[PDB]
Amino acid sequence: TIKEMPQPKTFGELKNLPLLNTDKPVQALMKIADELGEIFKFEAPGRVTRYLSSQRLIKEACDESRFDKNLSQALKFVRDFAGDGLFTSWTHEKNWKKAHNILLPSFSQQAMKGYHAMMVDIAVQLVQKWERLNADEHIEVPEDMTRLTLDTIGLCGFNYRFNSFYRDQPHPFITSMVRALDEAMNKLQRANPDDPAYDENKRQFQEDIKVMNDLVDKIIADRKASGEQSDDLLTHMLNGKDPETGEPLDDENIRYQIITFLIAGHETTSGLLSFALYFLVKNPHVLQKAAEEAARVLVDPVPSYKQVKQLKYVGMVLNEALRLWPTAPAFSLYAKEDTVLGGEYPLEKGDELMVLIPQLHRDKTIWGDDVEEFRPERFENPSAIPQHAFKPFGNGQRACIGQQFALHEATLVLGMMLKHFDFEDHTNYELDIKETLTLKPEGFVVKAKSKKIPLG
Ligand SMILES: CC(C)C1=CC2=CC[C@@H]3[C@](C)(CCC[C@@]3(C)C(=O)N[C@@H](Cc3c[nH]c4ccccc34)C(=O)O)[C@H]2CC1
Numbered sequence: 402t403i404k405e406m407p408q409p410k411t412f413g414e415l416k417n418l419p420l421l422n423t424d425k426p427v428q429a430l431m432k433i434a435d436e437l438g439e440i441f442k443f444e445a446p447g448r449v450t451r452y453l454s455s456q457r458l459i460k461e462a463c464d465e466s467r468f469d470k471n472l473s474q475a476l477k478f479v480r481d482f483a484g485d486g487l488f489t490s491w492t493h494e495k496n497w498k499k500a501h502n503i504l505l506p507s508f509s510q511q512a513m514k515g516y517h518a519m520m521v522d523i524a525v526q527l528v529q530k531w532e533r534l535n536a537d538e539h540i541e542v543p544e545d546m547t548r549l550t551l552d553t554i555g556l557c558g559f560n561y562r563f564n565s566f567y568r569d570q571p572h573p574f575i576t577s578m579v580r581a582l583d584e585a586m587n588k589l590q591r592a593n594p595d596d597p598a599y600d601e602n603k604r605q606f607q608e609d610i611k612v613m614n615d616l617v618d619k620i621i622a623d624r625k626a627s628g629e630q631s632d633d634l635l636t637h638m639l640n641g642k643d644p645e646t647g648e649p650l651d652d653e654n655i656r657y658q659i660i661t662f663l664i665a666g667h668e669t670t671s672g673l674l675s676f677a678l679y680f681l682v683k684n685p686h687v688l689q690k691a692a693e694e695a696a697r698v699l700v701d702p703v704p705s706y707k708q709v710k711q712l713k714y715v716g717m718v719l720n721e722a723l724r725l726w727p728t729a730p731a732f733s734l735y736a737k738e739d740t741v742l743g744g745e746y747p748l749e750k751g752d753e754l755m756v757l758i759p760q761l762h763r764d765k766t767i768w769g770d771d772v773e774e775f776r777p778e779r780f781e782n783p784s785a786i787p788q789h790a791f792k793p794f795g796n797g798q799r800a801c802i803g804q805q806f807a808l809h810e811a812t813l814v815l816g817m818m819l820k821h822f823d824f825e826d827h828t829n830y831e832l833d834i835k836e837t838l839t840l841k842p843e844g845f846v847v848k849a850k851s852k853k854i855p856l857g
Pocket of ligand 1: 730
């Protein structure tokens with residue numbers, strides 16, 4: 402039967418729009434999903450979307466013959482500085498497929514062998530920072546994980562050192578990037594954006610864009626000027642030719658790719674490490690098991706690529722953190738033709754869906770009753786997981802190109818953290834999830850006690 406879709410509470414002419422007038426929209430949408438179930442309609446003046454939460458329906462939304470990636474309003478606002486890089490381009494734009502074909506070999510599991518040593522450089526700085534803490538100082542976890550992740554993508558991506566472990570104030574590029582991202586997010590719940598009240602925002606936006614463009618174009622120019630070949634994405638993009646068109650990326654697009662990778666390598670990836678460490682300190686038996694793996698595998702002063710691959714349980718820890726709090730929590734699709742979703746909901750060509758990943762990852766039909774428990778063991782036998790049940794990296798040809806990079810970095814860093822330190826949840830931290838572009842455990846702090854194992 403053709404079933405009428407649930408809808409959350411309305412506000413007259415504003416429809417559902419005020420429900421997202423909140424600093425925690427994803428968590429609000431999760432509560433609505435708990436009340437309304439696997440799908441609900443969300444209307445606002447001039448737009449309708451449908452939010453999906455069940456594996457049953459998301460497995461169909463993940464059919465690329467029926468649905469393609471949509472640019473959400475969030476992605477549209479980011480496109481003002483991320484342009485037609487991979488993240489903010491439509492599948493049908495020529496620059497999408499070109500960049501996809503050129504960049505895929507730079508992001509493969511195999512290509513991680515090449516980035517491994519630069520990743521180690523940044524992880525060693527993190528370990529050394531923590532070794533150098535005085536007794537009863539503490540660690541600001543998201544803050545340090547972001548220093549690591551941002552620096553790792555800068556170094557591996559374009560041989561640039563943000564030197565984040567040398568600073569309290571972020572590098573000028575970062576300042577502008579974070580403020581552009583914040584601005585892009587603010588625009589989502591901003592009525593009358595054309596109001597002259599927001600004159601100053603617009604001017605600040607344009608300054609931040611200029612900062613970002615100037616530094617990246619200059620890095621681009623300098624590399625071409627020097628002609629040096631490096632272990633980095635910038636080299637692969639200057640050299641690469643798309644097999645299909647035979648064309649290279651132009652300098653403007655390369656800039657957008659760089660800005661894109663820096664956005665991703667910032668709080669999106671550091672979020673994974675932060676949530677992983679949160680769950681470990683709140684689950685001491687899991688921490689112990691992971692620590693025993695790190696001690697057994699990481700037998701050398703500095704981890705090898707092969708050793709990181711051996712950290713199976715650490716990999717499961719990361720997957721279980723991705724299950725509960727995926728740091729890129731939603732993505733958008735549109736129907737390529739008229740179609741019926743789940744045998745019950747007719748859609749017209751162009752109709753949009755949002756996949757609410759955290760809610761997908763709580764589907765009791767897939768995971769069982771214990772959905773709120775942190776149990777990395779759920780990931781021991783990945784073949785048993787039904788199709789499209791676990792989607793922290795999105796879907797299909799438009800899935801995260803950075804997934805292997807993010808997981809290698811995370812596994813290496815968490816491995817080393819677990820080898821070098823015992824951790825204390827010294828404040829009995831109460832989880833508070835701050836929502837920006839991404840999700841993070843705000844104010845999460847720990848004490849680390851060195852196990853006194855050398856890096857030399
Ligand atoms: C850039 C990438 C990393 C992101 C992707 C996102 C996708 C869905 C977003 C997001 C989680 C931010 C919170 C709003 C939400 C859930 C959304 O549904 N937004 C819809 C619905 C919506 C909210 N406000 C709007 C204003 C106009 C039009 C649509 C909307 C949208 O963006 O389209 C957001 C985080 C940032």
